[PDB]
Amino acid sequence: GLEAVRKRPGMYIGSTSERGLHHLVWEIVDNSIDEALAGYANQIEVVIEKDNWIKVTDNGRGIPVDIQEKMGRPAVEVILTSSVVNALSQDLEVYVHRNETIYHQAYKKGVPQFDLKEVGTTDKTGTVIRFKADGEIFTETTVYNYETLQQRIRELAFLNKGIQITLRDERDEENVREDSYHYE
Ligand SMILES: CSc1cc(-c2sc(-c3cccs3)nc2C)[nH]n1
Known about the structure:
There is one protein chain. By secondary structure, the chain is of the alpha+beta class. It contains 5 helices and 9 strands. Strands 1, 2, 3, 4, 5, 6, 7, 8 and 9 form a 9-stranded mixed β-sheet that branches. The chain is globular, with a radius of gyration of 16 Å. It binds ligand B48. The ligand CSc1cc(-c2sc(-c3cccs3)nc2C)[nH]n1 binds at residues 28, 31-32, 35, 56, 58, 60-61, 63-64, 79, 127, 129. Belongs to the type II topoisomerase GyrB family. It comes from Staphylococcus aureus. It is found in: Cytoplasm. Heterotetramer, composed of two GyrA and two GyrB chains. In the heterotetramer, GyrA contains the active site tyrosine that forms a transient covalent intermediate with DNA, while GyrB binds cofactors and catalyzes ATP hydrolysis. This is DNA gyrase subunit B.
C-alpha cells in the first residue's frame, strides 16, 4: 500500500521541500526513542554519511524477526514495507542484532530486493538503519543541514535525561565533526 504514498506524499509528510527532507530523520529516530522509553535502549547515534545517506543506530532489543501467520513473512519485513521513510527512499538497508545473530534486508522505494538473510554472529542487540532520499521526489534539495538536526537532537536528550544521543557529519572526510549529549 506504499504505492499511494509515492503518489500523494503530501498527506503523509507535508511538503516535499527541505523541511520534508529533515522529517524523514525524525521518523526513524522516533522509533529508537520508543525503545528508550520502554527501558531497553540507552544509546543512540545519527550520522550524515557521504552523498547524504543517513544512519541511525540504537542498542534496544532489535526489530522482531519471527515469521508471521498471515503470509509466513518476517515481522521486520511486514513492518518496513509499511514505512513512509522506506517508500520515499530510493535505497534503504537494515541490520538487526537478535537471537545472537545479525539479520539483513535491502529495499528500493519500499520494494524488497531480497529475503531477510543471516550474515553473522553477535553478542549485542540493536538495529541499524541507512537510507538515501529519492531525488526524483525531493526535487529542490537533497542536502541535509547540521544546525537544524543539531538543535533537535539537543531537545530530545533534554527531554529524555539519562540517554546518550550523538550526531556526526562524515560528508567532509578530512574534517569530521561531532556532538554528543547526555543529561544527568
Ligand atoms: C533505528 S530504527 C529502530 C526500530 C526499532 C524497533 S524495536 C521494536 C520492538 C517491538 C517489540 C519488541 S522490540 N520494534 C521496532 C520497530 N528500534 N529502532
